[PDB]
């Protein structure tokens, strides 16, 4: 009745999907074999007559290795083999390769399976697209898939949990190129886009979890906890229920402005746990701390427009009200003049489940703050010069041209990102 279709595109999408689905299995009691020893799972799993539960997810990638890792690992009897879709040739960090030449047949099969999945859902809250902006598979194929979904499904709410390149640290070289292309693509298709940065999550792990060597598994576990907190109100009852449709209404002031900073709290290891009180006010403050942001974007530079807080566990409305009143009275936290309330508080009675093998402690309270703020334009500003610096020499441009793109596409993407910068400046200004 509250089904949500999960899409995981590219290596990063699949690797965060592994953590997400392990977390969902742990939360709902579903064993990795597929079945558990009501109907709260229906959002993420569809049950069969035999009692065995299959997730409503689709693992899309043009490379076979990542998907075969899932096919060989513990969750081989859980997922649908055809829902795991594997390509033959990788996109090789080429947006054109993933969007024009290789991605065609793969996206056709993906839409086929997505139709089959949506046909099994009475209701459909929306799509959760988890991809990696900065890679040919994630950016190009993901952009094509989002465009097709917008064309055919229509008004279904697509929430894109995208991972943009970090300000200074990165793993690719053409990452500004394909990131600009995919941002051009997804400015007009996704309904609410959640920004994530590897550098910011690395900093969170290093400072809060005391992990001197954070890794992709830790990053994915944090992202999985955040998405679980986001979807908790769909699956578990509690005071002040918040919905996928209500995210857009209480978070998106205008259709272009729908990019969101995400921050989880508390992030504490068990050795540091039960060593602080972890009250509602303190976890709210931690969630509003700039270091707790999962994007290398200081909110002090900009102004908050909206903030949806998702409380999990033993949280009382009096405490959320007191904490939010303190936040409003706080001076460093600054809101736009045209949004006096700017807050969407929603509580859930289900505490965040702890993944065995993870670093997170078993905490009875949690906050997931997803905020629309004009500061997010800074990351686009960074990519806008990282792009044009290479584009001046047309470096690596032959690679993108070879798979059927044009200089006009790069020009249009750069112009649209400049327009997005201007829109962020205009919404920030009085």
């Amino acid at each position: 009745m509250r089904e949500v279709i999960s899409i995981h595109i590219g290596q990063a999408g699949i690797q965060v999907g592994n953590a997400c689905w392990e977390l969902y299995c742990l939360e709902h009691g579903i064993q990795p074999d597929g079945q558990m020893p009501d109907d709260a799972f229906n959002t993420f799993f569809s049950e069969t007559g035999a009692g065995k539960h299959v997730p409503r997810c689709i693992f899309l990638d043009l490379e076979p290795t990542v998907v075969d890792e899932v096919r060989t690992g513990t969750y081989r009897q859980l997922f649908h083999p055809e829902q795991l879709i594997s390509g033959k040739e990788d996109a090789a960090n080429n947006f054109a390769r993933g969007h024009y030449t290789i991605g065609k047949e793969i996206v056709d099969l993906a839409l086929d399976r997505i139709r089959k999945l949506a046909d099994n859902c009475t209701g459909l809250q929306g799509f959760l697209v988890f991809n990696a902006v900065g890679g040919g598979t994630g950016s190009g194929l993901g952009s094509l898939l989002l465009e097709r979904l917008s064309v055919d499904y229509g008004k279904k709410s697509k929430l894109g949990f995208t991972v943009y390149p970090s300000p200074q640290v990165s793993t690719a070289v053409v990452e500004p190129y394909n990131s600009v292309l995919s941002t051009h693509s997804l400015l007009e298709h996704t309904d609410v886009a959640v920004m994530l940065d590897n550098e910011a999550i690395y900093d969170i792990c290093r400072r809060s979890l005391d992990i001197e060597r954070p890794t992709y598994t830790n990053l994915n576990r944090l992202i999985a906890q955040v998405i679980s907190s986001l979807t908790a109100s769909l699956r578990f009852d509690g005071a002040l229920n918040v919905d996928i449709t209500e995210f857009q209404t209480n978070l998106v002031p205008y259709p272009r402005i729908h990019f969101m900073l995400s921050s989880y709290a508390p992030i504490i290891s068990a050795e540091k746990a039960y060593h602080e009180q972890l009250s509602v006010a303190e976890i709210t403050n931690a969630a509003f701390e700039p270091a707790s942001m999962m994007v290398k974007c200081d909110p002090r530079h900009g102004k908050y427009m909206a903030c949806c807080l998702m409380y999990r566990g033993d949280v009382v409305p009096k405490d959320v009200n007191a904490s939010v009143a303190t936040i409003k009275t706080k001076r460093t936290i600054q809101f736009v003049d045209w949004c006096p309330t700017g807050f969407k508080c929603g509580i859930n009675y289900q505490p965040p489940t702890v993944v065995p093998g993870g670093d997170l402690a078993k905490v009875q309270r949690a906050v997931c703050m997803i905020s629309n703020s004009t500061a997010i334009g800074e990351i686009f500003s960074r990519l806008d010069h990282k792009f044009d610096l290479m584009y001046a020499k047309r470096a690596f441009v032959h690679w993108y041209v070879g798979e059927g793109m044009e200089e006009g596409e790069f020009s249009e993407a750069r112009e649209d990102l400049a327009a997005l910068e201007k829109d962020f400046e205009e919404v920030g200004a009085e």
Binding site: S170, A172, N198, T215, A395, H398
Partner: protein, 431 residues
Amino acid sequence: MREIVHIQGGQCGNQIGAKFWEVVSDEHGIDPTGTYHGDSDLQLERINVYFNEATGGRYVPRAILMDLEPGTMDSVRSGPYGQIFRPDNFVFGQTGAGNNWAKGHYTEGAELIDSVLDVVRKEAESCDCLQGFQVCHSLGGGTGSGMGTLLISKIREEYPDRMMLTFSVVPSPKVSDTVVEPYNATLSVHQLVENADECMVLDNEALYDICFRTLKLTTPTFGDLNHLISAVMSGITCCLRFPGQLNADLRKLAVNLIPFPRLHFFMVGFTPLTSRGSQQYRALTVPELTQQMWDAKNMMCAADPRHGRYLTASALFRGRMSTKEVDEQMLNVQNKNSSYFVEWIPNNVKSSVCDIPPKGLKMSATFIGNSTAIQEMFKRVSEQFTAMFRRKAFLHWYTGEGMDEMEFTEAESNMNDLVSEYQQYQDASAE
């Protein structure tokens, strides 16, 4: 399921390829008789990248051996892994090329190229999906350089979209083996520029320097140099054969490495190369691997990076390691050595991580650098080629094979233009 067609050309290329296949079979637990004896699922998981299954349990390399004289490939069959290769993939002439590029490319290479292409097509079609071809040979020799460049041209004609990778042993700066090395190298560079999508430059003298300074060997035979080259050639494609935390195939490496199509010559290195005495005296950490990797002594190319500027650099790490640790190491290297990195590219490092380290080594890292430093190597080869060509010494041997004199000057012009492009992007300023 992304197959690679390995081709060996010339005596040096054949020996290097044999050592490479020995190393790969050791990594995958394949005995010289073809049977798997590794006792590990991951070894057999992606064995089809390099090998094909026979009627029984035998696993055969997807290797094609090319030569004009049969002595070198007789030694190939006498080698430790001489029995894995199919006898049909040995393509041999009868009169070897007398270190003559013209002989190996026009007169004697023309006839045998029929069989070479027939075998290449037979091996390529049987592949489900083909990543591309990798050709190991030595610039500065008749059959290897000439015949290999002819094959590369033919394969580029047949499969334009498929990847082309070359491991060329460029003639060494100080000590040269044969007299006509500048001629053969100049002629082969002209072909590699136009045809080869991705090319690695190797030098026997650089290999001697690394094996005498880092490994501290006293009498390194050619087997040891082939061993180091084989380590690099395995490490470049370990991401296809093994699961990776952040995997990167050959095409991804080329995309992140090559800014412009003609600047596709790369200088490679392998870590950790540790002397036997100091094996207990080295602590295997990601910073130590990066410190050795960015050292100019570890480069297997004669040109040192300090003279030029790094256009791009890919680092494929293997082993249980932190993505944060690796990424921070490479960012810190860039920040510390911002002088040696090109300004108009915001990030000059393509970092990849694989979960399978080589046997025995807890961690490893292979480095593939596209830098303007190779300009000085091409400049030295030009300084030799022009000196010999002005007096036209040994030119009559290439002329008697039906090669026009204008072809030499065309090759020299192409190589000089490549030098000019390298200088242009070495001294190019942002904005």
